[PDB]
Amino acid sequence: NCPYCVVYCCPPAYCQASGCRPP
């Protein structure tokens, strides 16, 4: 299950203030 952020994003990654970014 991926984290529910401003935009449907999945790992590998990290949800930060800017949003979902790559590894």
Cβ contacts of 7 within 8 Å, gap of 6 or more: 19, 20
User: What are the b/e assignments for 3-12, b being 16+ CB within 10 Å?
Assistant: eeeeeebeee
Q: In the PDB record, what is the listed experimental method?
A: NMR
What would you measure as the largest C-alpha separation in the chain, in angstroms? 21
For residue 13, give the 3-state DSSP assignment: coil
Beta strands in the chain (DSSP E): 14-15, 20-21
Give the sign of the dihedral formed by CA 13, CA 14, CA 18, CA 20. positive
